[PDB]
């Protein structure tokens, strides 16, 4: 149930769900190192978070592109480094830069979606679970996506990856349970983020996401950070290998139609193939 | 968010639901434990007593959950007990014989689905009815790590725990437009006092531990820990989902009672011989 | 793989019973069809009868699956036959009620578990012994996309296919070692007389196709040819599977029937109001 | 049922599981090409291939490095012009160079696994569904594994591209059953193959796996090979986005555990991280 004195790595943690889950375990009185892309968010993020955790929390940052392994090993040495041990782990960095039918995907940006979620992912985990098992255990957690858990049909590489992502936690806890690290994934729904406001406040596409949402409420990032707390924590402590969706029950009705979008664009025909 | 709430909680009497009773308790929640013995339901309130004030409170009421009117009484207690009814943790189940599926003891299923099919429906049901009303709160059902991964020989058990984990689904689909969020736990081996014989042998024990990445056995505050997390307001846009609390056994593999049963059957039993 | 066995088909006086049997027939199988009602029972003989010589011959024996003891007698007469039981196709079940979960008809709910958890596990114990003995065969029950995404306000249709799918697994894990494979199909919106109610909705009709991306409703024949496939020695190495035919209608979602149940029961007392 | 006059691809269809899809497909009067890396294994099989159909079956090949997507590309225009339509596949190609713990896995060795399995499945689907789509339907299979549906400890990036696999055939059936193209995955369990012959026919690894199979033996080519071919055909018209194993129900029970093989080489500790 707490988590004083105790030091975590979060990746996103400049923006979005990665910068929530980060002031969530800061204010419970954690250390926190965020990485992410960006040192003008990262510092920024940094300076915001000290406001909180008055109550023993601490925070630092190293930008690193987790495309780049070495980056990704140097800041898990850092963070573990920092007092001593790694306890947990939040990955929340990850993207998607495609949209549209999978018969004209640009595979460019399909690669690059790829190394971002599956190959990113596998450094993060491979480096810092050295650390946690060193350590005697810990706890990562995985941000997936209801994209994996439904099909979002023309989002192409992002639910794909995303199901990569969610078999390597559930691989990694198989192999790494002797050693008391637990692993687990969480698929958030529709989270309001100022990244999807564009989704968020269309008529058509809120919409239609409502509609597949059996709670009358969009996701709010406090909501992920939440369960990634509870995950990390203690209380969890035989919870492993688990692939939870944090979607308002989206998952029980289907992935989201985005043809209001995407038709006026691609048109009809294109969004069943055709070329 | 427990504090000025009230909960009911099925078989509350020993094992899971008594755990989960005794956090609720500590937190300051007012718990209604019912089952179908009356001497344990009373003596856990006495016990769970002693976990005094956060202002917490506990009281029974002896119900036979294959009885809907009865099922129903104990939700019109509950929730007139401080006028509404936050959610429902409902442990209340279990099974009655292990053997091969050609060797099944027919009345004893019959008896298992009656208790875990008709039974959580009942409390479903009417636990439904007044959480609607109310404005919303969170179902939790327990099942079993016997409806993710096949357990051999158990029968009724998994079959009727995954019938469970759909209604939990189904109910969070059509309930979710009034609040009402309900989810399943499935456990792994808990230790209690209905785990004696796999703990007295060395095969069924090892196997267990094979099983299970984490090098332990679950405890009933694994499962209690799950459980209030579901029902908080921490896990407010947490529906429709199906956890397991397991040690990670379900990347593996449901147990093989082989040792203990091949002396009983012999083997050619076991794959199905009359 | 057909002609020199014999096969029973429950539930095999109409729809996709009937299909499965008359695919058999065709193929030079001897098939026993049972089920509740005898005149459609040999309407369906009469029928499939006239599917003549591939040397394919047909019999009944009407047979209430909720009664164990007339379920075995079935499985000794079609063993009897020619002396072996090669398979099975469970297309007997159903559901009595569409309605909100706070107002389940409980005696509906219990009759659909009796018919489809209860009564699949009689013919599947009784098929089973039989095919261990004869040195192996293949089991195929038939569920439906009701198990594998929540249909709103269908109570215990789902519910209890859910629980027939487990048993599928179940009995698959159990019945290897004597070369028993155990399947489960999960039908889509299959076009026979039971659907009517879809068809004459445009909303309903509608609301399926959207759900669904193969721009077409499924046949009786789809399913036969599936089930064909898993008795066949063509699945040889198949067993524990859960399929949907269903033209990716799992993909999506359940249908939603509120267009026709509003009108009934009311837009609040679908999310649980009572 | 019939494949008469019909023309498919078959990936990887070299040698295994390929070499047998193709095998019966022209057995049964069907035009395939195989197309794989090695051109000395293409054209022998092309040659054996042709043994049979005397049925009115034809055989070509392509040598093709799936990971080039032009390459990739330009076999799938070859054998839909052949007789004008390609009416379907079956995508066998894809490997695996991981075996070890997580921790200590080979970054390059994981990134051209991604690289084969990911994006070479991608570009496969890519345009062979543009050509089926084009004709008015068609039906792809894609080859996954058992490793996709039982987490495989050691297997590292097998079974997470594997998943990563399997949700790309459910989205592209979700994309394109509007255009009557359906879309399924095969998950193979143990198959002998001359590829795996060291652990079908090793003691400890062999005794696992059958202590983890219901079924009293091991797979067999013509196993997976019927499996496509009933997918393939108009019998399976209604069978779209399903994830089918053939494994004699192992995936009931759990992945196999390769310790025997690995403890001597890895030690314990690192076997369950530990670097
Ligand atoms: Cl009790
Ligand atoms: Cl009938
Ligand atoms: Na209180
Ligand atoms: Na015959």
Redesign the interface.
Known sequence: LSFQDRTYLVTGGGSGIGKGVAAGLVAAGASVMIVGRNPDKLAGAVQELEALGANGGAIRYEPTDITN?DETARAVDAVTAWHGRLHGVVHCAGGSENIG???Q?D?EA??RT?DLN??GT??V??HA??E???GGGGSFVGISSIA?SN???????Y???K??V???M?????????????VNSIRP?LIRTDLVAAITESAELSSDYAM??????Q??VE?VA??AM?LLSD????????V??????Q????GPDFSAMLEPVFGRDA?????
């Open positions: 392994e039918p999978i018969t995907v595979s399909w690669r790829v599956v190959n596998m450094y985990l491979k679970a050295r946690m098992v060193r994996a099909t979002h049909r023309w989002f192409g590489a639910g794909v990856t199901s990569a969610d078999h390597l559930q691989l990694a806890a198989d192999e790494l349970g002797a050693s008391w690290v637990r729904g597949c949402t059996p709670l009358p409420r996701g709010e909501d939440n369960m509870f209380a969890a402590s035989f919870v492993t290998g688990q939870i969706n944090v979607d308002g029950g998952m029980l009705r289907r969004l069943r193939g055709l070329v």
